[PDB]
């Protein structure tokens, strides 16, 4: 729309204008972060106005007596000098910038950041029930400050900070249908236990049910006593060392029995939501602006080939269909050999035509 966001410095001498707060990360290029900064040349006194775009990873440290204290690790930093224009090294003006400059007058100066591809999106890690502080995760932020030089102590009264979000939306073209199959032969079996699971679609929306078609062909002499089907969120997190995490966001344990020399076929419906997953500390949620409720983190879309090992948080989802089989011959039947398959799927928001904020707040 034609609306813009403005935020002023504590002293009121500096203010920043942005036409958006969520910037869409298409797989090839991101939306430019173009804005307008309004200065007071009679107050600067030969100073300069610097606007900085920072992608930072916020993390906590558990080896501390103080609780609720977090750090920041910068992943990407960009700088532009605004009040004194660069010697013809200035980006072309977008239409919103033209309107903002003509509206604000002569003391309004533009800034534009080009976020490089393969950078992490805004992901917020869910704080625990007992956690008083700033939530961990990756977020972007635009900061403008008056300073004589870049390497200087920034005063709080002369700077203004604005949190922005990098987001992705569901691809328009659906992918191939997710299909997984497996064949298991036990120790003293000599016969195969076949499991075939599939999803109805490759791309799902938040709050939308997922249908899992499970076809079991038991040609062995062991009994499948329980079928476990779950939706798992995978978080590839690279902060100081590469780490991978797994979290089930939706579960369905079915007491469905498959007899020896029998065939089974059922469809199971699951829907991941946040109301039953709020206790899971560290769960990946979509980027927040201040503290508002966000859905589960959308699937991170990476480049077509390779371009892996991102230093942020990579989110993906899988459906695991597990068959538990009553083992016999060497154990006391307490344990059970598990035959499982995994189905990867995409969980994202559809491409919108307006601002994501639902504007609902007490």
């Amino acid at each position, epitope marked *: 729309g034609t609306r813009v966001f403005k935020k002023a410095s504590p002293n009121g001498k500096l203010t920043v204008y942005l036409g958006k707060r969520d910037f869409v990360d298409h797989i090839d290029l991101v939306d430019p972060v173009d804005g307008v900064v309004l200065v007071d040349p009679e107050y600067l006194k030969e100073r300069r106005v610097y606007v900085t775009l920072t992608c930072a990873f916020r993390y906590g440290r558990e080896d501390l007596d103080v609780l609720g204290l977090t750090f920041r690790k910068d992943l990407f930093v960009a700088n532009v000098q605004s009040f004194p224009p660069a010697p013809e090294d200035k980006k072309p003006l977008t239409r919103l910038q033209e309107r903002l400059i003509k509206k604000l007058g002569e003391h309004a100066y533009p800034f534009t950041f080009e976020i490089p591809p393969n950078l992490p999106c805004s992901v917020t890690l869910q704080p625990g029930p007992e956690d008083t502080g700033k939530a961990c995760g990756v977020d972007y932020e635009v900061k403008a400050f008056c300073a004589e030089n870049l390497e200087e102590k920034i005063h709080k009264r002369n700077s203004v900070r604005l949190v922005i979000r990098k987001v992705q939306y569901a691809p328009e073209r659906p992918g191939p249908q997710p299909t997984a199959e497996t064949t298991r032969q036990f120790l003293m079996s000599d016969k195969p236990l076949h499991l075939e699971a599939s999803l109805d679609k490759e791309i799902y929306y938040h709050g939308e049910p997922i249908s899992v078609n499970v076809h079991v062909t038991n040609n062995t002499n062991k009994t499948v006593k329980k079928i476990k089907i779950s939706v798992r969120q995978y978080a590839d997190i690279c902060l100081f060392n590469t780490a991978q995490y797994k979290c089930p966001v939706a579960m369905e344990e079915a007491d469905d029995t498959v007899a020896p020399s029998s065939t089974f076929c059922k469809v199971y419906t699951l829907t991941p939501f946040l*109301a039953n997953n709020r206790e899971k500390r560290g769960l990946a949620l979509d980027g927040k602006l201040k503290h508002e409720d966000t*859905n589960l983190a959308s699937s991170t879309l990476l480049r077509e080939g390779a371009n892996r090992e991102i230093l942020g948080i990579i989110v993906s989802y899988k459906v695991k269909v597990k068959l538990v089989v009553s083992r016999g011959g060497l154990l006391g039947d307490l344990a059970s050999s598990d035959v499982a398959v995994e189905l990867p799927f995409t969980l994202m928001h559809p491409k919108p035509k307006e601002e994501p904020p*639902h*504007r*609902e707040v007490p």
Partner: antibody
């Protein structure tokens, strides 16, 4: 065909109780929010209660905060409005309305409305 | 925001076919653009016309248009058809006590 069907309205005494049902069809309770709006005879629209069912939150108007209770049946895809301690001022036509859970809060689908009468 | 009040200035309006009908809604506090308009015929459920104070809902004829200026909102009907004689409500959905206006009834004139 997206639609909402309401039921459970009728005659009550000033102090009785009612339960309203909104049989949702064509959408899920996790991608949609269910709201109850009543219209007193000759008056305008007044929001009563809402349920998100994705964030597990329920909201009520300040006039029905304690007496009214909204709940949803996810498996049956049906929302409920249990109204207790009904008063004569609660006489209205109660509509159950739907809104997108994500990135929308206007009411795009409405039920036909069930008239609730409360008198001695 | 304690409780937003939506005040529709025209409580009742009479207009002929083809006339331009303008209904305005005033909010006691800034609710941004989170404003919707609804049409209600007698005995029928309200039908959503516009949302976000400017966006037209799917299936609504192009005659209906919404616009925001400040804390006030306006719904305009261009070339008022005989199907457009009903009661219209402005609603804000910026705070969980979502509030409607008192309604604007559009009548015929002769």
């Amino acid at each position: 065909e997206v639609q909402l069907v309401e039921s459970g309205g009728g005659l009550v005494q000033p102090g009785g109780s009612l339960r309203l049902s909104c049989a949702a069809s064509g959408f899920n309770v996790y991608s949609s929010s269910i709201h109850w709006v009543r219209q007193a005879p000759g008056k305008g629209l007044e929001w009563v209660a809402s349920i998100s069912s994705y964030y597990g939150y329920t909201y009520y108007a300040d006039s029905v905060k304690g007496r009214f209770t909204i709940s949803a049946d996810t498996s049956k895809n049906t929302a409920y409005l249990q109204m207790n301690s009904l008063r004569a001022e609660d006489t209205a036509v109660y509509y159950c309305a739907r809104s997108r859970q994500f990135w929308y809060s206007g009411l795009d689908y409405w039920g036909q409305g069930t008239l609730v009468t409360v008198s001695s | 925001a304690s409780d937003i009040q939506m005040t529709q200035s025209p409580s009742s309006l009479s207009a002929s076919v083809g006339d331009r009908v303008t209904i305005t809604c005033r909010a006691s506090q800034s609710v941004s653009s989170a404003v919707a308009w609804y049409q209600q015929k007698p005995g029928k459920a309200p039908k959503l016309l516009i949302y976000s104070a400017s966006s037209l809902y799917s299936g609504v004829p192009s005659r209906f248009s919404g616009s925001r200026s400040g804390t006030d909102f306006t719904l305009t009907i261009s070339s008022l058809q005989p199907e457009d004689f009903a009661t219209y409500y402005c609603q804000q959905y910026k705070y969980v006590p979502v509030t409607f206006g008192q309604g604007t009834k559009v009548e015929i004139k002769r």
